[PDB]
Amino acid sequence: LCLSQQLRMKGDYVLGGLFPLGEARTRPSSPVCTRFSSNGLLWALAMKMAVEEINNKSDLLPGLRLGYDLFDTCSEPVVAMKPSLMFLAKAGSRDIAAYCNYTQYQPRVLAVIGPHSSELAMVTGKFFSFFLMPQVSYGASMELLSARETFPSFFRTVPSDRVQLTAAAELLQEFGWNWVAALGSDDEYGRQGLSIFSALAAARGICIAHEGLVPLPKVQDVLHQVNQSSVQVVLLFASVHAAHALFNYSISSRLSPKVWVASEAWLTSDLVMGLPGMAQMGTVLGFLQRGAQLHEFPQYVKTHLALATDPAFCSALQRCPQCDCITLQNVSAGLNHHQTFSVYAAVYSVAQALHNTLQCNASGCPAQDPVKPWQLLENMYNLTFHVGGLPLRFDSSGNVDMEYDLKLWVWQGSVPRLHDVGRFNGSLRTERLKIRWHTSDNQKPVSRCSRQCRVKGFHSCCYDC
Amino acid sequence: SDFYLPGDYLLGGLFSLHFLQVPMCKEYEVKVIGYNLMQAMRFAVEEINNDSSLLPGVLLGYEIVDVCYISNNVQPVLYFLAHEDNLLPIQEDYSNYISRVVAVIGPDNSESVMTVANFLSLFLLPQITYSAISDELRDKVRFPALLRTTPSADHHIEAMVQLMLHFRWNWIIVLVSSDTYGRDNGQLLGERVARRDICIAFQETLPTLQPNQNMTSEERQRLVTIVDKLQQSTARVVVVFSPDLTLYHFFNEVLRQNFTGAVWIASESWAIDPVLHNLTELRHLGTFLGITIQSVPIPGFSEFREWGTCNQECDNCLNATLSFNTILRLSGERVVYSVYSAVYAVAHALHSLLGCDKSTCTKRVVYPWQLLEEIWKVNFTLLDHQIFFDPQGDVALHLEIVQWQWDRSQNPFQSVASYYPLQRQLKNIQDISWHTINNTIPMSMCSKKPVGIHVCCF
């Protein structure tokens, strides 16, 4: 299909890409991923579309071409480290020197559109921070990436987990639920979510009755401890598989309905929405990211896949050997993905930061020596970049800002659907008169403890008067 | 200087001696423990060279680089992996690639070891870490080339639980720190303690507060609330999982608030911490116990220590360790022997790989993956301890519950129990001087029909 041949195009400033194009030792041999992942290719194509339509623009990066180096990084970090080491090699050379600091390097890519994975983002950001290479990531949400002490050059176009956990704590405090149970997946995502929510609850007056980790596919003990407390609201900050395992077990065990606060991982995933019998396990309330979508992206994918088949185009014109032997059917499933806008916005943010750094103007742009990657960091913080007509900004911590929508599962003929019952923009706003609860009538469930009159709670907050 | 000795086979060393501009590690406050461990590694290399039986005719060199706790854990690794011209090639296969160092004695904190191992895994360069106790380092698919000469937090938590069971404490308080170390340690202790009929009254997180700094009022109120919760609670055994730096402010409130009569259990972070025992005012707070490594006396190392590119030099280390010489001498060797045995395990693996015996060796070229292959199978006697690695890259070195007795003329941390990781059983428990009126063992029970979530309470 000559598709993998288009993961590289030269330019005045070449971008870098870390996408999960493929999926899965005694010798130090880099593993090769032969399995094909559709999301990785879709995100690579989103970055490609952003770069090409930036090149088409006249008032953004005038008179200069923008390239990219899309590199397949599996979920493993050992396979992703090699593209990073190639990223930081001197242009035209296959060696990376061992200098005492960043100022002596001349990297071959201006910036890196970092990995989707949060653990991979941690590893590659820790590596890139030595060289002060700007790396803006899509879909890496875990909060500890926001520490400028250890990640001076890590940016992201997705909100961190702290924003949604603050929204959840605000929802608990507004609804009067100050006696709740907090659960998280046993992986790093759930543990970090639990650690953040502990401090948020302690600051907001909420006490956690029980704080457990749900294992990925024990669970009986976790659900028994949850039931031991008179807790009506449970915050489940877990991944899709851990949440699915817990919900399957509690459905099989006929566990009583509860208010479930949903992370963005399983709030919308059809694996848990379509689980039979879930309608009898209480209301699911979650915060879903309020972001835009690439309206012309599916058209772009289909026309690019159609054009890749022409022998003349490829003749005029490996990273992903399995990307050649595919068809439109293998990729049309995830065409309307939200992370495509995140990749597109990351590319646009790097383009705007570069345009500001060179001090280019609409008619033309001044000529000077090429800028090092560390020169972008000054103009990446405190930066306003417009993506699809909607303004976006990078925080002092490298975090982007977007609103959230409070959604609930409304059941109609065993078909759960999301409806807007709130909106978070740093301050929660809800319409509880249109929230349909699971109780006998439409009364909000009561999950409360008395702070003043026997001590109780995981952190010894409440009292049993 | 002492940060480099030319030799036939080099040996990287990473020791913790302490956005546009990068603050070098040399400007931070000097940590004596790192310099002590670095001297331990140098003495081990020197003693290996002295001895004509192990690696005969082969010089063992090293390249020691000052690493920080978090700040710098990248360039050191890039420098070790590069050639003599500070140039590291990028290639898919490293089976025939020769690095400057053949193995590294890795850093001492979990995050630094993870960062170094995530980049050494591409070359399968051996890395033996001392004093790092994360249970996550036991993953040999995530860290194929990572080994360890200390027990993990598994055995530290096991020792704590056995100490609790021996003295019949089933009502304990857990205080963790905000960093990943305290959270992981507290979660592991809780999950282990929940199945041995010991209940946790509550758990709290201490704020991140480095000493010698001005702290805000919110942290002060948090400490006030935590100490008030401690005082109100009926549990009189407190386990603290926090770095050795962040506890000075917290113990001052326990004292300023005058909360007395508790048994404090210390993680390895601050159990043998000499500057923290230097406080000398916590004596009225109860009894202090701590989990750490058994002392292994290295003959000739105390006299060797007393006799003595970038991030590779410190100046205040000698003058800082001069004032701690006598307490370090009396406390023995705990992590020093870990560095010693790491160096000796690497040397024995090199000796086995070269295939020589009491005569000149073959002096062949060595790839670090080959040395990593050969080092899993080392099994030798070093100072009357058997040094061999578990299938998860760990050495079963005996732990020790140690009791803080305030006496400069004796061992400042008196050993009271010995933990054996191989059998996971704590034995040889000696007399403990209790804070009670008649030296009776303190009681930590919530109950002399169930009440509450805890099974221990009724």
Ligand SMILES: *[C@@H]1O[C@H](CO)[C@@H](O)[C@H](O)[C@H]1NC(C)=O
């Ligand atoms: C760029 O403009 C060309 C015409 O100059 C057009 O054919 C192409 O589709 C555009 N590409 C984009 C918008 O990505």
Ligand SMILES: *[C@@H]1O[C@H](CO)[C@@H](O)[C@H](O)[C@H]1NC(C)=O
């Ligand atoms: C859960 O708690 C309820 C209410 O106390 C109780 O009836 C039930 O037996 C408990 N266990 C399960 C498995 O539902």
Ligand SMILES: *[C@@H]1O[C@H](CO)[C@@H](O)[C@H](O)[C@H]1NC(C)=O
């Ligand atoms: C749900 O849990 C039950 C009870 O343990 C088990 O038999 C069943 O296989 C689980 N279902 C799935 C889809 O894993």
Ligand SMILES: *[C@@H]1O[C@H](CO)[C@@H](O)[C@H](O)[C@H]1NC(C)=O
């Ligand atoms: C394309 O789809 C077909 C039909 O499902 C499948 O057999 C093939 O492996 C796919 N190609 C890939 C994954 O590269």
Ligand SMILES: *[C@@H]1O[C@H](CO)[C@@H](O)[C@H](O)[C@H]1NC(C)=O
């Ligand atoms: C814009 O940049 C061009 C090219 O460097 C320069 O000649 C011109 O003066 C700048 N300003 C305007 C207003 O065109």
Ligand SMILES: *[C@@H]1O[C@H](CO)[C@@H](O)[C@H](O)[C@H]1NC(C)=O
């Ligand atoms: C930088 O942030 C400050 C403080 O929020 C703001 O006033 C300023 O406009 C920002 N600068 C930009 C967006 O260029």
Ligand SMILES: *[C@@H]1O[C@H](CO)[C@@H](O)[C@H](O)[C@H]1NC(C)=O
């Ligand atoms: C956030 O939403 C509230 C209403 O919920 C509104 O009054 C406020 O202006 C909004 N803030 C921003 C910064 O948009």
Ligand SMILES: *[C@@H]1O[C@H](CO)[C@@H](O)[C@H](O)[C@H]1NC(C)=O
């Ligand atoms: C980088 O290292 C060089 C080594 O020559 C030194 O001169 C320079 O000051 C360093 N830059 C920093 C620390 O920002």
Ligand SMILES: *[C@@H]1O[C@H](CO)[C@@H](O)[C@H](O)[C@H]1NC(C)=O
């Ligand atoms: C042996 O090691 C000691 C340190 O204990 C050192 O002083 C000495 O030079 C070495 N060689 C001999 C021959 O003693």
Ligand SMILES: *[C@@H]1O[C@H](CO)[C@@H](O)[C@H](O)[C@H]1NC(C)=O
């Ligand atoms: C703040 O720091 C200064 C300077 O070290 C010190 O003298 C003072 O005691 C600290 N605290 C307050 C409350 O000023």
Ligand SMILES: *[C@@H]1O[C@H](CO)[C@@H](O)[C@H](O)[C@H]1NC(C)=O
């Ligand atoms: C103990 O500390 C408390 C709390 O600050 C203080 O009021 C009291 O004077 C101190 N001394 C005694 C002997 O209680």
Ligand SMILES: *[C@@H]1O[C@H](CO)[C@@H](O)[C@H](O)[C@H]1NC(C)=O
């Ligand atoms: C230990 O504490 C004492 C008493 O405050 C102090 O004088 C001494 O400097 C401290 N440090 C040592 C002995 O290293």
Ligand SMILES: *[C@@H]1O[C@H](CO)[C@@H](O)[C@H](O)[C@H]1NC(C)=O
């Ligand atoms: C150590 O302190 C002594 C005085 O006690 C001084 O003479 C010497 O220069 C110091 N050494 C250093 C700062 O390296």
Ligand SMILES: *[C@@H]1O[C@H](CO)[C@@H](O)[C@H](O)[C@H]1NC(C)=O
């Ligand atoms: C190591 O050697 C000792 C002494 O010969 C032996 O008893 C022990 O089984 C060996 N250990 C292993 C793990 O092979």
Ligand SMILES: *[C@@H]1O[C@H](CO)[C@@H](O)[C@H](O)[C@H]1NC(C)=O
């Ligand atoms: C302490 O023990 C001694 C020795 O048996 C006994 O005489 C004394 O009465 C005891 N005191 C208390 C307060 O139990």
